[PDB]
């Protein structure tokens, strides 16, 4: 799937998601 776009972002958003939780950790 060429959605490496949602993924390219997802990884960024994910890192952010992680950071989001990380922020509390």
Swiss-Prot record:
GO terms for biological process: defense response to bacterium; killing of cells of another organism. GO terms for molecular function: toxin activity. The modification Leucine amide is found at residue 25. Its main location: secreted. One of its GO terms (cellular component) is extracellular region. Keywords: Amidation, Antibiotic, Antimicrobial, Cytolysis, Hemolysis, Secreted, Toxin. The keyword Secreted applies. The keyword S-adenosyl-L-methionine does not apply. It comes from the Eukaryota. It is found in: Secreted. Expressed by the venom gland. Has antimicrobial activity against Gram-positive bacterium S.aureus (MIC=3.79 uM), Gram-negative bacterium E.coli (MIC=7.81 uM) and yeasts C.krusei (MIC=26.3 uM) and C.neoformans (MIC=13.2 uM). Has hemolytic activity against rabbit erythrocytes. Forms pores in lipid bilayers in vitro; pore formation is reduced when cholesterol is present in the bilayers. Belongs to the cationic peptide 04 (cupiennin) family. 05 subfamily. This is Toxin LyeTx 1. It comes from Lycosa erythrognatha (Wolf spider).
